[PDB]
Structure formats: C-alpha cells, structure tokens
C-alpha cells in the first residue's frame, strides 16, 4: 500500500518532469535502451520531493510492462530519449520479444 503510493508518486514525477517520455494521455512511444540510467542522473532532484531511486525503477518497470507500451514496440519504430528526441529504432527481435510478452499476459 505505502510502496504502491510511492510507486505511483514516482510515475507522477516522471510524467511531470519528462512528459515526452512518460505522459501517456495521448500517445506512448518506445523508450531508449538504457532510459533508466538517464533517469537516475536526476535522482537528487527526485529525492528532494520524496521519490527514491528504487521507486523510480519500479515506476519505469510498471510503465513499460503496460500492454500499450509493449504494443508500441513495433519493428523500426523510433525510440526516444527523455525529451522526445529520436535516438534509435526498434529491432525485429525487440518487436518479437514484446509481442511474445503480450501473448503471455493475456493467457
């Protein structure tokens, strides 16, 4: 319960500070491989408002396990950094891994 609200807080902090990556009100886009390391460079600012590094990791894990995120991992879609800049493209293997994950969760 407390850990859940702490995870939700981390997700709200991610959407407020990096909405290009984590504001999913209209769209969701593939994230850079290693986006977690980029987020953790901001850990000091997050901790001042009550968000720990481990809650930042839990929030990214929750965000990227959602089916709508897995569904956006299609071959040659663009991966973005925290500010929505294009950095790479989704590979066929990554797209296959994502669809396999979706099929497992609905079963």
Author numbering: 19 to 125
Question: What are the paper's exact sentences on this?
Answer:
The ProQ/FinO family of RNA binding proteins mediate sRNA-directed gene regulation throughout gram-negative bacteria. The RocC/RocR system regulates competence, a specialized physiological state involving the coordinated expression of multiple genes which allows the bacteria to uptake environmental DNA and integrate it into its chromosome (i.e., natural transformation). RocC binds and stabilizes RocR, which in turn binds and represses a series of mRNA targets that encode components of the DNA uptake system.
Deletion of the N-terminal 13 residues, which are disordered in our structures, did not impact RNA-binding affinity or transformation repression. Furthermore, we tested the binding affinity of a RocC construct containing an additional C-terminal predicted helical region (RocC1-137). This construct had the same binding affinity as 1–126, indicating that this additional region does not play a significant role in RNA binding.
